[PDB]
């Protein structure tokens with residue numbers, strides 16, 4: 001890539017988080033995923049002391065479009081100041097002489113939250129699942145305090161580390177590793193379906209859908225609804241049904257997250273408080 005063609009403010013931000021190429025070993029034989037625009041590999045990052053850090057290494061497939069390259073780097077820069085236990089962090093960006101720049105993330109042992117709760121070999125309790133939702137709410141409370149609007153909050157975009165800590169994330173250009181200007185319409189607030197604008201209050205709607213994903217252990221929402229009909233479906237006066245093991249107060253929280261008026265949906269601060277209380281009523 002020719003750095004001189006990129007936005008100078010973007011390049012300066014990248015240099016503040018740069019990883020030297022010799023400190024990063026990309027295991028091209030160990031692929032985490034491949035999509036149309038990017039791919040992700042296992043990697044080993046060496047710090048100044050020689051300690052090996054297991055990481056995921058995200059790459060573009062092509063480097064010929066300045067728009068794709070700029071967007072790919074911007075995704076990494078957007079993350080750079082996220083410092084919270086429930087938000088995925090950025091290890092850095094490796095600029096190489098040849099090939100794609102590399103976005104380097106701490107490796108998440110248990111992958112994405114949706115596949116984790118769908119895996120019949122794991123047995124999270126109701127309390128565990130509510131705990132996962134509480135952790136997401138805490139990450140979103142942090143992001144909302146930075147005035148950051150996520151725009152694609154969903155279980156598929158949350159990661160789980162080796163301690164089962166949930167990290168809010170966004171696969172971004174690697175999201176295709178559903179969407180139908182490809183939009184996750186079944187997670188979108190009614191006003192966003194109509195205007196395609198997003199706010200923290202539309203993230204709250206998406207969070208309510210994520211809670212429903214948790215309480216169903218990863219069922220697809222609105223499975224019998226055509227993607228282009230979801231607005232009509234909702235406007236008939238409908239919401240996702242209460243899952244069988246979802247406690248009544250948590251379903252009430254979901255219904256508040258789906259309030260027809262964005263301004264009346266609870267803040268993520270309120271959601272953390274309310275879900276903390278519900279969580280605490282469970283022994284296990």
Ligand SMILES: O=C(Nc1ccc(F)cc1)C1(C(=O)Nc2ccc(Oc3ccnc4c3Oc3ccccc3N4)c(F)c2)CC1
Pocket residue numbers: 032040055056057058075076079082087088103105106107108109110111112143150159168169170171172173174
């Ligand atoms: O997250 C982002 N931005 C952002 C936005 C909002 C926010 F609040 C926080 C963050 C970005 C990004 O690229 N995110 C991203 C996420 C997850 C990835 O995949 C990983 C990452 C680590 N280890 C796992 C690997 O996937 C797996 C799959 C299966 C089994 C195991 C793993 N392991 C990835 F490569 C990249 C866009 C910059």
